[PDB]
Amino acid sequence: AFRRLVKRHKITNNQMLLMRRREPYKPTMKDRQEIADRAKLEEFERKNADGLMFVPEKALPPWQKSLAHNAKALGSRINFRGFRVRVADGQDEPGFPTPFR
Amino acid sequence: SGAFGCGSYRSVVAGTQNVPRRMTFYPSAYELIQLHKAHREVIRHFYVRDKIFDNKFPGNALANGLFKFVPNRRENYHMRELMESIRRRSIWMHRIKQQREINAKVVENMEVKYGKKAAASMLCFTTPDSNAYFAPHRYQDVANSWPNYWQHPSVNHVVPKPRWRRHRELGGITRVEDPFAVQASDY
Amino acid sequence: CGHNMIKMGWMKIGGSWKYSRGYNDRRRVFARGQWQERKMTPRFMLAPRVSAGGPRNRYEGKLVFSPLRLSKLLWAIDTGRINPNEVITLYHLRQANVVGEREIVWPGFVLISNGVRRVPYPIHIELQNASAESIRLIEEAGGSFTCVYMTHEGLYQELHPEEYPIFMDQELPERRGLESLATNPSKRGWLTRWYEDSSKYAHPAAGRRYSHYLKPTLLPWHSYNTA
Amino acid sequence: GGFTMKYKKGTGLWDEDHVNDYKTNRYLSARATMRWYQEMERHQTRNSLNARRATQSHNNNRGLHHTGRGAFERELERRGVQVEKYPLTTTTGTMRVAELVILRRMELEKRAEEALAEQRGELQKKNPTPSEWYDESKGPLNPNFLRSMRSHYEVDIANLPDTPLIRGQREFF
Amino acid sequence: VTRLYTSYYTGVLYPNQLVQPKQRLPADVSVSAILQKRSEPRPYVPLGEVAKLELQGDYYMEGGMFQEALEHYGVVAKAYNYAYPENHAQRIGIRIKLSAAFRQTGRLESSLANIEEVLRMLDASTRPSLELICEALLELGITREALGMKREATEAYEEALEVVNSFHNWGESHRMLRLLPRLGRRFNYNFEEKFVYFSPFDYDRTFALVDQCLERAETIFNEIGDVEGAIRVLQQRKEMIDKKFFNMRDFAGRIHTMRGHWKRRAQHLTNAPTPDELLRYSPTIHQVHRDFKYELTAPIGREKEVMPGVNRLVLDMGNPYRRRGRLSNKMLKDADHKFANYVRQK
Amino acid sequence: SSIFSPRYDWRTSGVHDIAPRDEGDFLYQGPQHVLPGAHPLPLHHPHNTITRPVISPYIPSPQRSHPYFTAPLPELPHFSTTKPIVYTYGTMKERIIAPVFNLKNEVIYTRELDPFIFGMYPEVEELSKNLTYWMVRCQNFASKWDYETREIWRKAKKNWPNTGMGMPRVGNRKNHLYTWGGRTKPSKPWNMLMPTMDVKTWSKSNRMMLTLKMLQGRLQVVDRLTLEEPTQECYLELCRNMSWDVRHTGGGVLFMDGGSRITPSSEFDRAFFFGSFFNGRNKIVRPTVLCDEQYDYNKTAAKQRMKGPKGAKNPIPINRFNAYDAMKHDRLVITEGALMQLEDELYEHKLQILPPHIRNQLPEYGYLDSEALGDCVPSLKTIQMEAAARTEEAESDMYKSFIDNPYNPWKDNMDASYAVDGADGTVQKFVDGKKVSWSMLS
Amino acid sequence: PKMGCEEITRKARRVQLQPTEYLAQHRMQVWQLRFKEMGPPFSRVWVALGGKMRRRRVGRQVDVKDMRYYWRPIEPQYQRLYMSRLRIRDHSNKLRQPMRLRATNADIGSGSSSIEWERASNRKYGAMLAPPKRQDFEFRVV
Amino acid sequence: MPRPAPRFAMGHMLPHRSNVGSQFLHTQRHGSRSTWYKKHYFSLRPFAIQRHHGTT
Amino acid sequence: GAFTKGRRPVMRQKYSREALQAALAMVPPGFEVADVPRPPQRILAQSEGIVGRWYSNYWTLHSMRYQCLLAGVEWPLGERQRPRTNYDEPFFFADFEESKAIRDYRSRWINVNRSLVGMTK
RNA sequence: UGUUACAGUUGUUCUAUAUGUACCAAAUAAAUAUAGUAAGAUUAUUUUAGUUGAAUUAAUAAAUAAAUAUUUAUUUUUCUUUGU
Ligand SMILES: NC(=O)c1ccc[n+]([C@@H]2O[C@H](COP(=O)([O-])OP(=O)(O)OC[C@H]3O[C@@H](n4cnc5c(N)ncnc54)[C@H](O)[C@@H]3O)[C@@H](O)[C@H]2O)c1
Ligand SMILES: [Mg+2]
Ligand SMILES: [Mg+2]
Ligand SMILES: [Mg+2]
Ligand SMILES: [Mg+2]
């Protein structure tokens, strides 16, 4: 499903009449798809180089923040240390030791 | 009725002790503006209620003595709009009079605590930019607040001063003697 | 001056039409797009329902208040819109134009202390369902809050007092409102004292409890006495 | 039928207010303007008179007075007591108020023009020649304004030279 | 596609390349008269090759090789004196450069002699260039301050200022460069076309010359200890740069991306009236001469000054209802007589 | 045609006769030759002080901020504004003083103008909003009718089978393809739209237009607009004495009749209003720049039998001041009563526009002295408004013995007692053990 | 059509002003039952509760600890479609944000805070939102 | 300014029904032409004959 | 809303204090407000003003009751409902219409106190 | 030869064919009633910027569909280049 009406370009050099592709130095469609996949995978690996940093309740996505806050506001109203609520949702376990942990 | 600044029947039933309040000076400028416009509204309501027919054309000159409102609609208008506006004006007057009494008390306390001139200087609401709104000829040398900034005496040097002269042969027309400048026209 | 023919751009009038049927299906409300439905079911069909009304369902009398910033109230007071010498109510807010009529929907408002950690002066305000932190701030400053949880008729009468020449019997709030805000001592409800008063349970003649205003014309035409 | 703001219809200061007029033109001649005023007054008067006629006819058909009052109010009027709670001002009262206001305005205008003529005589006797305003330092004067102000001075004001006469440059007259 | 510009790329045609004329002194006023009122209180010559030589000479002068610049200037000045008649613009300009080279080499007496000869040639000229006279007396002032005549140098700088404030047009340099930001139709890319800027130090060389004159005057005044003169010169310099900026001022048109409408550049690129000429020839101060001999309308009293006609009969006013029935014609009955009595003669 | 077109310069000969006519044509003498009409600036209306004379102390100059007086003249009596002067964000920040003209074409005295009214510096976008609204509104909407396919009166039956004869496939053939059929989306008066104008923008644009007239110098203030007789010849004699070119071709006149300075009124003078009906370029408008808030009681097409354009059902009346009429009519004549009415109607607007730290200084400086509270004698008003005020003052005596007195509402509010009867489920008000509150019916 | 055509000389059915659609016609109950709209103004996400909804025989999925109650945002293309259905109203106004999933206090207030509702004492300040008042004790019908 | 008045509905353009156009754009009637003197595409404009359109 | 009495007045005549007293004199001695019941919903809420036998009209009776309260006129008739605060004579009543036992002040006073106590949030 | 009775939901007294006024889904009057919608037309030159065969996992805690088009956003190093 590509453009059947070919784009027209102002011909400044007579070799533009011969060239079919607009940017010949640009990789082909599937080649640049593979290139983008590889680059995004490398960026993701760089981002996950360090372990999964556990995050407090305020820096949570909206669909978890208020749930986790309400699940323990009752116990937080009474100031005493060592109270934990085992909420179902939240960050998952990494499975290995982490410097942030 | 919470319309006045005293409190509502709900607060009365609750028994909240809000009677002794901190008397702070309050000029009630917004309230005075609202009272002005409410007074104008009441006068306009009376006018539109007392409007009677006065037709200038013979086809309509048959009912030149009657009210433009039918009696029923005139009564309904007087019963709703006119007296609701009067009640709103009365509410504004009551609030402003209460605040004036409190302000008089505060002024008396400040005068007996510091002195007349000290209390007046402490109660004065003068801002260093009040001239920009009340007397801009005293604020010209402070900042350029003109919509036509090029004519401000600080930036007035940019406006050109042509050499005009009247020509009797053209009918008293004023014409500038400055010769035009040649323009770039080709390249 | 042109046609925004999809996947082609802004084409010129009288130009080529042979390569646009999506533009015709955009003009005419007829639509397609089964490329995602050919195999998998839609997300609204896959997701279950948490309740018969749905999440955040605004059922009748849900007590959905519009927020009122304590910072906004303090800003209005410091500006000069609101007189702190008097008891501030929703009528006073609306008259000082602190809130627009667009925002006023039953139940009235909630005082939220967003961006304020200290109130400098005592403020006596009447609202509904103020936050515990804002109530604490006002009390520490020295003011007083009263959770005046009123019905719809009471709200309309408080917002339009001139339409009522005399005081009229105002009904008590509903059961949910009575148990939540009116008789709640934490919210400083306006009926907590009446609810705690036990002299009304003894005899039906002793059920009524009187209350008085606590204690410490308007003609525009004045006589020309200055001479 | 349907809902229409009858509570706003007729509330403006003039007859043209609160009228849905969508048959106008960007330029109206003398006849067009006369007909526009005629149609506004006619709309108002027809509305009022038709409402009055319908109300009076309905009351008469129901058997009451043309104002809708009954036997109780008729007997009250016979005894001489006031029937309505709030007797509003009548046409005679409104016209009398307008008349007395206009008469006070006329008297004030007489006294004001007397005092103003006195002050103008004093000012013209004091100042024979124009003041600082009669200068061309920033631009030319206006011959129309000069011919309107000629009657205030002894010297010829409208007679302007071709040179931009300046106050401090050359003594005028 | 990006452009590497490896091959030869022909330049583009842009309105900033318009051939700007030279500001000329009026024929009546003379530089000699200005100096007096201040004191009161062709044969064939290989001009291409001599232009190469003069360019090399000014390159030497800019690089700091003053003796070589001086000898190049001498050769090209001999060539120009042979090729041009007496009191010519290029002749006086090249001897300006020659006096500058003399002063830089240290022959201050000969530099002053040459610059005085330049001044007398400017006086003899009919309509000399403002840039030429300003640069000439700027070189005069620099030579005077090198000799030790600081008061005379300041006098020369001040006379530069008083000439450029009385005969130079501050808006003509950016007449065709002021509406250029309205050509840009793209906001995400190529958006520098909406912010194209042209420095006045490149399109008004008289402005830069007078700016340097005032800078040197302020320096001399600070050295001497004349706070009044320094304040005066700085005020005038600020006023000049403010006039330039004001004549460059303009509001913004469309901000975001516009597709199509390429024929709007005809409206964009025009002789747009600069702020200076607008405020000068405002239609109220510089009024338009309007003769009623070529018109069909005139004031109430001047009825007979209209364009004449043969057998003119005033029928009536063109009352569009006269085409209607007898009742309309009866309604339009006395209007003609009343109009006649309204426009009657005094 | 377009300039970038081949057909632009394809006329090569025949445009001009080589022979010049011996009556008007002339030759160019040179630079000193003063050509009639030639001007450096593009002037689509090249007028001067003779064709379109300005009525102001000075000719509008770039060295002057406005072509009027900046200080009161010592030989003319000066009258300040009816309301105090305050400089908002858009005002000219300079004193504006204009001469008041007598009906004998003489300057009797001078009067201060309000910068908020005649000092709001004009802006092209606001003036364009005003003009566009006025034109779109003044269009006639009843003539926007057109036929639809369902309004063609043809048989609701296929004329011929699609495959039978060589004719094309068609059915009712009452559509737009045929010369007798109608369109599917025709023009309808109820489908057309009438724009909505807010009071803020309307007032701002009107004050900008007034300021533009003042800057151009075509504003003239007179004391009265009265005629000895209500006839047209008296009006034309007044115009001839005042040099008002009310001809269809001359610079038209726009009157704003608001009455005298001592006697202002919201109604036009009867004699002048009857005399001003003349077939020329003259228009009289109401002494106001504000407008009523526009509404729309058919925003969702609930009433289907509505005949009229969508949008505001309360458009601006024709006799109101507007940018179109101000541009069409050269001179703008305004009365002192109209000035007073404009000031009285814009006072509270500019006070609410004011910033808070300046608003708190208004009672300090004395800009909020309300006569309703007894701190000043009442201010001057129009005839009708003073009549309404006197009527109110007289009728106020009937609200004394009644508890519904609007001049003293809820007077027994502090002295009463409130009782929460839970069996009745209500809070009631009592005075001396008697229920003074009222239970609403139904 | 033509000026004197027989098609227009004779009368026919006359078209009237068409009625408009419901203002909230394009918001559906399926969305309000399934998802909810969360997040800041320009980062709104429609979230639906996760898990595999399935009705099986008795004896399967005994351990309730696996079935977790949690909300996860729906696919962005479906969210865009559902938001466009709300954008349908007032298409030409580019300065108008899309309609919300659940009505807010501001919308319920704007429903009657206009100029054409200033006199309607009823249907003001959430009349239908508020609970009903007590009827008369002698209330009856025929 | 809430939705300023449309420039196309200003009464200065009564154009032929085109492909694009707003619901509030008043186009020319069906069967009627936009320009009055253009009987054909080659019809000339009358020299001194002026047809007053719009206002009186 | 325009048929029944909802937020809408039904008698537009507003009489003076003397006209209020003159309209109360024509009421026969022995009449009580509790005698006239509230008409049902399907009955149009209207008031013919002060006519013969006007006290029989429920809407005219209470509309005049409110006008006498504003003008400060002593209302000669009784209250619409008399509250039972103490246990006095009669110590037993008969009501075949099952309304007196539930509309009693003592019967609804205890039901409110039951609900006020039953709240356990 | 004419006149009677039989009229479409069906009539020619079972069914079928045929036929019921010049194309038997009979003819006349209304319908934008609606076709998962087959197809055909769709008014305006001189232009001013990115990809030309990719993407494709129904369904519990997995970073990301891609192409096309419109608006819009990132001046970080380096020998040059680089549509992210
Ligand atoms: N929903 C409501 O009931 C509602 C709403 C707004 C205002 N009000 C006000 O409440 C009051 C009583 O309402 P209600 O339902 O009990 O009765 P109502 O309004 O149905 O009837 C009141 C009766 O007293 C008369 N009346 C009203 N105002 C009067 C006045 N100022 N002076 C003299 N006579 C007057 C009326 O014409 C009528 O005869 C009235 O003032 C009314 O305007 C009621
Ligand atoms: Mg629902
Ligand atoms: Mg829906
Ligand atoms: Mg059969
Ligand atoms: Mg893209």
DSSP string, E79-111: HHHHHS-SS-HHHHHHHHHHHHHHHHHT-HHHH
Breaks in chain I (C to N over 2.5 Å), named by the residue before each, are none
CA distances in angstroms from F418 to C124, C126, C213, D170, listed in the order given: 20, 18, 9, 86
Task: Determine how β-strand G35-38 pairs with β-strand G45-49.
Answer: antiparallel
Flag if C161 and B87 touch (Cβ within 8 Å): yes
- Point out the nucleotide closest to C12 (alpha carbon to C1′): J44
Contacts of F442 (CB under 8 A, 6+ apart): G136, I4, I5, I6, I38, I45
Are F67 and F58 contacting, i.e. CB atoms less than 8 angstroms apart? yes
Residue nearest to nucleotide J68 (CA to C1'): C7
The DSSP result for H1-56, as a single string, is: --SPPPSTTSSS------SS--TT---PPTT--SSTT-SSTTPPPPSS-----S--
CA dist., res. A36 & res. A48, Å (int): 18
Please name the chains neighbouring G, where neighbouring means 3+ C-beta pairs under 8 angstroms.
A, C, D, F, H, I
B74 inside 8 A of chain D by CB: yes
Mutate to test the interface with C, among G68, G110, G124 (most CBs of C within 10 A): G124
CA dist., res. B177 & res. B183, Å (int): 18
Which residue from I66, I69, I75 has its CB within 8 A of the most atoms of ligand 1, so it is best to mutate? Answer: I66
H19 inside 8 A of chain C by CB: yes
Flag if D7 and G119 touch (Cβ within 8 Å): yes
CA dist., res. C131 & res. C186, Å (int): 10
DSSP C210: E
Are A89 and A79 contacting, i.e. CB atoms less than 8 angstroms apart? no
Q: Which residues of F139-168 are buried (b: 16+ CB within 10 A; e: fewer)?
A: bebeebebbbbebbbbeeeeeeeeeeeeee
Chain B window 116-175: which residues touch C at a Cβ cutoff of 8 Å? none
H or E segment to which residue F331 belongs: strand F331-335
Q: Please list the residues that pair with F97 across neighbouring strands.
A: F69, F112
Are C116 and C73 contacting, i.e. CB atoms less than 8 angstroms apart? no
Q: What is the token pair recorded at F249?
A: 């071709």
Are F214 and F115 contacting, i.e. CB atoms less than 8 angstroms apart? no
CA dist., res. F338 & res. F221, Å (int): 10
CA dist., res. H38 & res. H14, Å (int): 14
Residue with CA at minimum distance from ligand 1 atom 5: I7
CA atoms within 13 A on the CB side of B135: 6
Resolution in A: 3.1
Ligand nearest C55 Cα, by number?
A: 2
Annotated binding site of I for NAD(+): 5, 11, 14
CA dist., res. F356 & res. F354, Å (int): 7
CA dist., res. B162 & res. C140, Å (int): 70
DSSP F265: -
Residue of B nearest to D38 (CA): B57
Atom of ligand 1 nearest to the CA of F404: 31
Residue nearest to nucleotide J42 (CA to C1'): H19
Q: What is the dihedral of CA D4, D6, D10, D12, to 10 degrees?
A: -70
CA dist., res. E320 & res. F279, Å (int): 10
The dihedral sign for the CA sequence G89, G91, G97, G101? positive
Specify the amino acid at residue C82. I
Burial of G95 (0-12, 13-18, 19+ CB in 10 A): exposed
Method: cryo-EM
Atom of ligand 1 nearest to the CA of F442: 15
* CA of H21 vs chain D CAs: smallest distance (Å): 23
DSSP E141: H
Annotated binding site of F for NAD(+): 404, 438, 441
Are D100 and D131 contacting, i.e. CB atoms less than 8 angstroms apart? no
Residue with CA at minimum distance from ligand 1 atom 1: I7
Q: Please list the residues that pair with G37 across neighbouring strands.
A: G46
Q: What is the token pair recorded at C225?
A: 């006495």
Ligand nearest G89 Cα, by number?
A: 3
Count how many pairs of residues, chain B against chain F, have C-beta atoms within 8 Å.
142
Report which of A55, A50, A59, A56 is spatially closest to residue A97, judged by C-alpha positions: A50
CA dist., res. F256 & res. C62, Å (int): 57
The yes-or-no reply on F/I contact (3 CB pairs or more, < 8 Å) is yes
CA distances in angstroms from E143 to E106, E230, I83, listed in the order given: 10, 20, 117
CA dist., res. B22 & res. B105, Å (int): 11
CA dist., res. C155 & res. B7, Å (int): 15
Q: Is F156 in the pocket of ligand 1 (CB under 6 A)?
A: no
Contacts of C200 in chain I (CB under 8 A): 113
Residue of D nearest to I50 (CA): D72
**Beta carbons within 10 angstroms of residue B162's beta carbon:** 21
Flag if B60 and D38 touch (Cβ within 8 Å): yes
DSSP B82: I
Give CA angle at C120 (C117, C125), nearest 5°.
Answer: 90
The dihedral sign for the CA sequence H13, H15, H17, H18? negative
Report which of F74, F92, F89, F85 is spatially closest to residue F112, judged by C-alpha positions: F85
Flag if F404 and I59 touch (Cβ within 8 Å): no
Q: Is F398 in the pocket of ligand 1 (CB under 6 A)?
A: no
End-to-end CA distance of chain C: 75
* CA of E277 vs chain D CAs: smallest distance (Å): 16
| Positions in chain J where some atom is under 7 Å from a protein CB | 23, 28-32, 36-37, 41-55, 57-61, 63-73, 81-84
The yes-or-no reply on E/G contact (3 CB pairs or more, < 8 Å) is no
Report which of H9, H8, H24, H1 is spatially closest to residue F129, judged by C-alpha positions: H1
End-to-end CA distance of chain I: 39
Helices E31-39/E108-124 angle, 10° precision: 120
Q: What is the token pair recorded at F58?
A: 């000075």
The dihedral sign for the CA sequence A47, A52, A57, A60? positive
Q: Say how many residues make up chain E.
A: 346
Are F114 and F81 contacting, i.e. CB atoms less than 8 angstroms apart? yes
Q: Which residues of A30-54 are buried (b: 16+ CB within 10 A; e: fewer)?
A: eeeeeeeeeeeeeeeeeeeeeeeee
Cα radius of gyration rounded to whole Å, chain C: 29
Three-state DSSP class for F310?
Answer: strand
Flag if F403 and I69 touch (Cβ within 8 Å): yes
Q: How far is the centre of ligand 3, averaged over its atoms, from the C-alpha of G30 (Å)?
A: 10
CA dist., res. E278 & res. B37, Å (int): 45
Q: Say how many residues make up chain D.
A: 173
CA dist., res. F258 & res. F382, Å (int): 9
Q: Say how many residues make up chain H.
A: 56
Q: How far is the centre of ligand 1, averaged over its atoms, from the C-alpha of B39 (Å)?
A: 25
Q: What is the token pair recorded at F201?
A: 């923008």
CA dist., res. D35 & res. D24, Å (int): 11
Three-state DSSP class for E116?
Answer: helix
Three-state DSSP class for C144?
Answer: strand
Flag if C161 and B3 touch (Cβ within 8 Å): yes
DSSP I68: H
Three-state DSSP class for E33?
Answer: helix
Q: How far is the centre of ligand 3, averaged over its atoms, from the C-alpha of C42 (Å)?
A: 19
E1 inside 8 A of chain A by CB: yes
Q: What residue has token string 């003042």? A: F214
Ligand nearest C9 Cα, by number?
A: 5
User: Given 3-state DSSP classes, what are the helix, strand and coil percentages for chain B, each rounded to the nearest 5?
Assistant: 50, 5, 40
CA dist., res. B31 & res. C95, Å (int): 9
Report which of C176, C200, C180, C201 is spatially closest to residue C189, judged by C-alpha positions: C180
CA dist., res. C18 & res. F161, Å (int): 29
Alpha carbon F340 to chain centroid distance? 16
